[PDB]
């Protein structure tokens, strides 16, 4: 059904499936990671339901759906975080009532480095003037791509559709042909960095488990999927 939809119907479906922006519980190391663990755990439940509303994701087997989410869940949270923090330069909008600074990432060992990478990605989106329509395409790409080689033709076909959709948006924005190729390439190259942050953050969360705030049962499962 995903392949049938036009670029406009592809955008509208992704825009309609967008998860809400959740609030934090109304810092030291323990208190901050406590708030973030609680937040991320509630976001995952919405992400899972968001993924099921992603065109082509339903058509996959239950096992493949699980594998893709396990691979990219932190990437998806991050690109969401980065997007939310776009109009808050120097700040990370984890939640509307939880704005974190670069100096606030210092009271957790090895987190200030992840903060800067996130802030830099948000700064990159701001400079590129990333659109909401572009953002929902990128996030869907992360979902379908990040765990596609750890397995296929259908997933690659949906990926091509989102690519067609991405170009369509730029072609409707008034960009020339070479401007469309360059902007597309620029966006997709950022996903490589989002993966990098994810693997760094994943290793950071693993240190948390090997120290006993208590991670949620769901988070522990998503975490264990990365060995």
């Amino acid at each position: 059904l995903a392949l049938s939809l036009t670029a406009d119907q592809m955008v509208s479906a992704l825009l309609d499936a967008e998860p809400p922006i959740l609030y934090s519980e109304y810092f030291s190391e323990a208190s901050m990671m406590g708030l973030l663990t609680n937040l991320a755990d509630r976001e995952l439940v919405h992400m899972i339901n968001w993924a099921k509303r992603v065109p082509g994701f339903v058509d996959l087997t239950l096992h493949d759906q699980v594998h893709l989410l396990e691979c990219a869940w932190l990437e998806i949270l991050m690109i969401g975080l980065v997007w939310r923090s776009m109009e808050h330069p120097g700040k990370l909008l984890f939640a509307p009532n939880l704005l974190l600074d670069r100096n606030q990432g210092k009271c957790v060992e090895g987190m200030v480095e992840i903060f800067d990478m996130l802030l830099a990605t948000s700064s990159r989106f701001r400079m590129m003037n990333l659109q909401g329509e572009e953002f929902v395409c990128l996030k869907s790409i992360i979902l379908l791509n990040s765990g596609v080689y750890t397995f296929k033709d259908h997933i690659h076909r949906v990926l091509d559709k989102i690519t067609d959709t991405l170009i369509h948006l730029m072609a409707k924005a008034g960009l020339t042909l070479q401007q469309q190729h360059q902007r597309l390439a620029q966006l997709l190259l950022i996903l490589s960095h989002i993966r990098h942050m994810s693997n760094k953050g994943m290793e950071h969360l693993y240190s948390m488990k090997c120290k006993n705030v208590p991670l949620s049962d769901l988070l522990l499962e998503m975490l264990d999927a990365h060995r």
Partner: peptide
């Protein structure tokens, strides 16, 4: 089985 299984089914 994983929790993720249930949330993907419900």
């Amino acid at each position: 089985h994983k929790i993720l299984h249930r949330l993907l089914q419900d």
